[PDB]
Design a protein around this ligand. Structure first.
Ligand SMILES: N[C@@H](Cc1ccccc1)C(=O)O
Ligand SMILES: N[C@@H](Cc1ccccc1)C(=O)O
Ligand SMILES: [K+]
Ligand SMILES: [K+]
Ligand SMILES: [K+]
Ligand SMILES: [K+]
Lengths: 503, 508, 504, 499
């Protein structure tokens, strides 16, 4: 009844009892591409496979996607135990790159002039450096820092020109070729969708991906440019906006209102804004996502140590758990599953931490705040969704069963953070897969034929859900579940709630 | 102020500075980087509240002089009592440590232990100064009696790990699991070994008697596993040391299993996260930390988070994003104090580490929803006159948007009682006793000030003078200004009584 | 909508019409003044929900005709089913009454200090004056002793026994007043122990079964076993008739819990309680019994000393208005009118005044607190949906909760939790339609339409019926929202289906 | 707990456990004005003596006041047991009277209202006079006119220069010089009559505690009374009587102007439909409780007890409901002034109001009154009441100068009694206007040292509470005092064990 008493009763020497409710997203690459590893990653709890289009060809990604689907459909022969697995396309997005040295040393002792003049784009050195961002000179000033190679080189602009910068180095070191630059000042005006991104996104539509992780989102109009490129054929593809610099954090509200969800890229924010502040930015963006009922993913610097070790550090378990407790919907693994020595061990550990963290979630408190921050009255569907969550607490329910076309009704229930799992029963395979983005939704794909009597159809899907719930040990005979259904086909939105005994 | 925890998170702004003070204590380990009068002065100005001496190293003479330097730097500010910050001295015991020997030769300094290599562990004294890739001496004579084939051995705060492949009479052959650079005299952990070293050794008796002799404010008692360990320390401190606070360090699994009895015997707790990471997996340590902070917050006993704080700042002038987040989350869990180790003791940026610890603790204060902490700490309490007065002072602090709660205190008890309930407003604890002003730093939200003026014959005039002093301090630290309200807590009439007196006074 | 009760009292305006429906039921006693088809029609129009027949007086033949007149008057509205108002019939039992006889040949005044003789001799039974009094309790001489006390005319007169005489009793008039023919008599401190169910009550209860009454008001209930005797007499044929136990004495109050748990509901008879319980206490018994009834979700009727001035006057006193309003504010489901409608000169006027007061009192009910408290003093699938439906009626500022019910249980379950919004209960069973008037906030409507083949179709027709009733009654208009509760399948046990439906 | 569980737990066979916390005001007249009866009414719980200046000469009222003070001071020898007793002056106020001669004079009839001063003492069931000049200027077609105690209703058809044309609506006998009420009508009569001015100045000279100002219709009537009481009478409490529709309409500005309010239900019931007065009563008590101003319920309380030694069920229920509505005080009129059972009427008022206390859910009142920090004063008051609940204290002890501190605590409606220790006798008397204040008069000399003077007054309250059965040794009380001699408010809170 008190958060403090929940913390006081935490017991490291008893196994975690509540289900993992947060999604696991795994970057698939060389170490994890193979069908056999992919099957093991699915059984160990991967919900979403991420393809990082910063590297690899279309051919290479097509085969990864084929292995992901082969590994996923290997479990299809049991509809009660089959777990849907979503496919995520993560774009390269806009970059600023230095181009070719003829590496070199660097210290303040010599000033570094930055030039954009294409006749210098292969003769980079400690005296003159080339940059591929033609419009740099408009968006920087004489106070502004310039980070080179993932923040290990910092500069400080002293003379701004029309098409040149005079800097002087801080935090010097070993500058090499084609290194990534960051401008903490920000308001960079690079397109939003690079030439490669438009091809990549078209391939995404053809490969039938469930969602896009759109890199370097700075404003609402970037999200709407990705939407427009995905076009009419891609309109049901979820757009997750990646927040990676200071301007994204500052314009968070317009990006959130434009997006299907959000990814917080902590390592990227680590470069752009001070370390004493990134934790506030993460707690802020997760809170605003929770309030809006929109999925938020925490990404980068999760279990990096597990690229080379089979167990993570104390600090990594704490950072991952504290992301769950901030209210993240999903946690994403990068190199730990893409290229590291322990891909399967990485998935298993992400699972153990997210599950252990559930002990420290106080569900009723999240609900009471989230219910009080809802509109004054809202539509019918909202009143019903909140009513189903309220009922779930007051009957100590095993689950909330939601029959959904698009997932919207399941999504509405999830925003309110019931303790009870949301078993989202869907015939649409894409909405089954997209559902993994949301804390506390367990999607199941009903393949049964559409009955002709609607009340018979509903009864079959609910029976399906009852069977899934029993097999997963969410509940058993004598328990009560909430059920949310539409009324007759002919009406709009799931506006119908029953409290039903588990037969 | 915001009605929900959620709305409080939603309003966090990285672009606007903090509007709360830094309410958590900063404990800094003093070592070769930091023990100069010059450095200590800067460190006090930048937020250091407690100076920690690590008696794992150094002579009594070395530490006498560090203490001397701490007090010289501290009293250099005594000239203006409105600006004087009390600074406590903590003595951190060796305890039952295992240490490796000295690296041989003159042409390595450190050796590289590599994945899969064989390493022999010897107790043969002929090797205590000839350690290398192949032979490692350590100083725990009965190691071969408490270890088995398969047993894990951890060296240098967990950075190197070994597994015992063969056992001998007076040696162990081991396989390097986790490689690393092994230097001289590193710390060794034997998870699930029944290490038979005593809680209080003869050296620990001598260290604790020297703390009493040097008038230290608090003892950080290393490797506490049970209450009789705490009792043993309290007995060595004896009658002369009866006002010295004992902070029990939880460093292992047994310390966590027997936590309640350790808490009940202790004045406070230090959570050693790194050391817990050796006997306890990563998917479980965050839970240990949250449980022990919560139980401490519930008992009203000070709790310090230590180890693995800003260790990157040993070599760099700025921390990582992960360290900021980890320190912030220890504040948000309800830690009273944060302790720095090598970052201040021996590193290249001791002053930049104190400043960064202050910056992070101050930013973290913006994510604390004080009202919820208070309402929960109020509910979970049973109810003497002193306690209802303190809860009333805290409730009033919130209702009045108080700039502070001024507490006139002899022992510190009344200031501690108020701090237990986690007001938003700073607690200015006005003490005439220099030891209670120093010890007050163990508690979240207490800003101790030492009143140096003599006692007036007239009680009510003595109270106004002391309250006038607090109001000058609060004005100068920018806690409040003319036209704000403060809560004042005092006794009624001279003579040891209940601090039962609450007033709401407008700030002139 | 007020954050606090206090604000809610502060915002009361005497000058602005009422913005809520009249939610409490009106029970009217039908007698010579109110018997006629014509009056009954007018009383139904002015808000009479229940017709009470007092079997303390009259023949089975006489009451047969009153019931016929009520049903004629009621069935005259049937032709528009949107406007038809169910009207229940109640049978109020004699029970173990003690009554004085007839004045000799005019009335007599009993003046303080005087002697008054009570005689067993049936000679004087139609000869009662200032000096001698007959009463109809044959054992009166055997059940009192010198010092014993005796009350008359309901109240107002008090007598102390000075001499006992085998077939006579000599008393002294402690309290005076006028003395009427056939008046009521009380004997506190004497084991009267006349049965709760006499031979005449048996006959009257069997008659009520025959005449298809909706409910029985059982007089002088003192314990659980008295209720079970009434229940037995109604037997199998009368099993769906609602028993309302009248609490009329100190034993009823002391044994309240076992009576409540044995009964379908409770009638608080304030005047009768006033006789053995002092004035400093009766308001506490009234408030306790209404509270416990609200707690148990059982109907509670407040009766006696309501609008008794309106027997002789076209208007009530301010004290009467305040006393009725406070019974409503206490949480009464129904208000009963007695002599005001039975025999007085202003039957229609007393019905209209009862509607005005009850409607104006609704302004001062703090619904949000009642629901929060009844919710906190409560889960079952049945209970969760009902509570959910009331919670949604607040959140959506709904115009009504529409409930499809067979027996009425689902409607009663919603009513226990006390929504602001009216409950339109749609029945096909005319008895459940009638019985639903015992519950605060239920507006019952009778669906005449035949059952549709397809279950979902039939549900949507009934809902659209309630939708049309609500609109005609001004509860809601197009594009307001309402809550709807149904069963799931044709035979689905539990009305467990909740929707929030726009008003078309 | 819930309010519902509170009603459910009520038990009529359980003796009342808690003290009566509402004030009792008794009208003193021929049946009650002897020193002997006054002594008994004070022992039985009378807190305020009301003098009705509608009748009696100044000589008569001066002797009643003298007897009230003789009776009160007869208990002065034991300061632990002495109950302060307040004196209230209740003004005649502006009336409208008919004016006839001879013995006396039933629907229809057609009555004509002449103002023509011809018919001063010559009127009948055709022509009726009255002394209100402007009656024809503030009335229209449809207007009601009541005569006697609303016994007879008229209906104005036609309106002219100096006359009216009406229709008898209710029938009865028409006596001489009988009161006249104008429903929904904005009467422009002077607010303070020439008798009221005399009567108010007599009140100042007699050192009365409070005035009950009759027929208050607007803020400016309250200001007019305040100006007559003047500087000499500035410390006299003005209670505005709400007796008609305009008073109800313009309540917010009358309350802001006034020290407190009297709801005159019987007079409201003439000016206003009977089925609306309970709303008016509940509204004004709620608004008074919100402003922290005393509210008194008056008229139609225990009227049966004029002739009978016990009240009716209806009367018991109407008094109890006035207490449960949030009334600070209940007033008796004829029951104590002129009827046959004046002592019994006081005792029954105590019993009813004490039994009603069982039905008050204290924490709810407080929690709502807190929700609806002005200054350090308000912060100390709220925190005192909070502490009284947490520590389950037997009292809140307030060392009061003006009594403002005590009144500030009483607003938030603690369960625990407020023992208001006053050295100022008028402060002790005026405190009775507030629910839940038990005022005590300290008669000890001021001690040289402020801290010893405080300890003395607290020890005095501690002995009072022990005697009264409020608490016993080892209980806890909340103590509010000033800080230092002459501080502007009771700003200092202690939780102190009862020794
Ligand atoms: N969506 C994830 C997480 C989850 C588990 C259990 C319940 C709800 C959600 C899954 O399907 O496995
Ligand atoms: N003021 C009244 C009422 C009261 C009694 C007891 C306690 C509180 C108030 C009195 O002193 O009698
Ligand atoms: K990418
Ligand atoms: K140490
Ligand atoms: K009867
Ligand atoms: K008067």
């Amino acid at each position: 009844d008190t958060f403090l008493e929940h913390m006081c009763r935490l017991d490291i020497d008893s196994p975690p009892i509540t289900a993992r409710n947060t999604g696991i997203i795994c970057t698939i690459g060389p170490a994890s591409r193979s069908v056999e590893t992919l099957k093991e990653m699915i059984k160990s709890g991967m919900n979403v496979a991420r393809l990082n289009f910063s590297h690899g060809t279309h051919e290479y990604h097509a085969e990864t996607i084929k292995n992901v689907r082969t590994a996923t459909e290997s479990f299809a022969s049991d509809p009660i135990l089959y777990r849907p697995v979503a496919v995520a396309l993560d774009t390269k997005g806009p970059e600023i790159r230095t181009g070719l040295i003829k590496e070199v040393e660097l210290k303040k002792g010599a000033t570094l002039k930055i030039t954009l003049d294409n006749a210098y784009m292969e003769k980079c050195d400690e005296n003159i450096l080339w940059l591929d961002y033609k419009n740099i000179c408009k968006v920087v000033e004489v106070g502004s820092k310039i980070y080179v190679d993932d923040g290990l080189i910092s500069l400080q602009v002293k003379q701004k020109g029309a098409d040149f910068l005079v800097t002087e180095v801080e935090n010097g070191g070993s500058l090499g070729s084609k290194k990534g630059v960051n401008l903490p000042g920000a308001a960079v005006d690079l397109p939003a969708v690079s030439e490669k991104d438009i091809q990549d996104l078209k391939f995404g539509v053809e490969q039938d991906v469930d969602m896009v992780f759109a890199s370097f989102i700075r404003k609402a109009s970037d999200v709407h440019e990705v939407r427009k490129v995905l076009g009419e054929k891609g309109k049901n593809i979820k757009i997750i906006s990646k927040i990676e610099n200071h301007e994204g954090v500052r314009r968070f509200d317009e990006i959130l209102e434009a997006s299907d969800g959000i990814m917080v890229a902590r390592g990227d924010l680590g470069i752009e804004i001070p370390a004493e502040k990134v934790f506030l930015a993460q707690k802020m963006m997760i809170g605003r996502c929770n309030r809006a009922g929109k999925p938020v993913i925490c990404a980068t610097q999760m279990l990096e140590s597990m690229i080379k070790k089979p167990r993570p550090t104390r600090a990594e378990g704490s950072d991952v758990a504290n992301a769950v407790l901030d209210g993240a919907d999903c946690i994403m693994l990068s190199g730990e599953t893409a290229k590291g020595d322990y891909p399967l061990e990485a998935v298993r550990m992400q699972h153990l931490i997210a599950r252990e963290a559930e002990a420290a979630i106080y569900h009723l408190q999240l609900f009471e705040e989230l219910r009080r921050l809802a509109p004054i009255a809202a539509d019918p569907a909202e009143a019903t969704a909140v009513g189903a969550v309220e009922a779930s607490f007051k009957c100590c329910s095993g689950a909330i069963i939601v029959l959904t076309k698009s997932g919207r009704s399941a999504h509405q229930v999830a925003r309110y953070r019931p303790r009870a799992p949301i078993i989202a029963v869907a015939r649409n395979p894409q909405t089954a897969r997209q559902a993994h983005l949301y804390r506390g939704i367990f999607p199941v794909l009903c393949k049964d034929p559409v009955q002709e009597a609607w009340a018979e159809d509903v009864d079959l899907r609910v029976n399906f859900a009852m069977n899934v719930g029993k097999a997963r040990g969410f509940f058993k005979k004598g328990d009560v579940v909430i059920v949310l259904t539409g009324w007759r086909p002919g009406s709009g939105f799931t506006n119908t709630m029953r409290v039903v005994p588990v037969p």
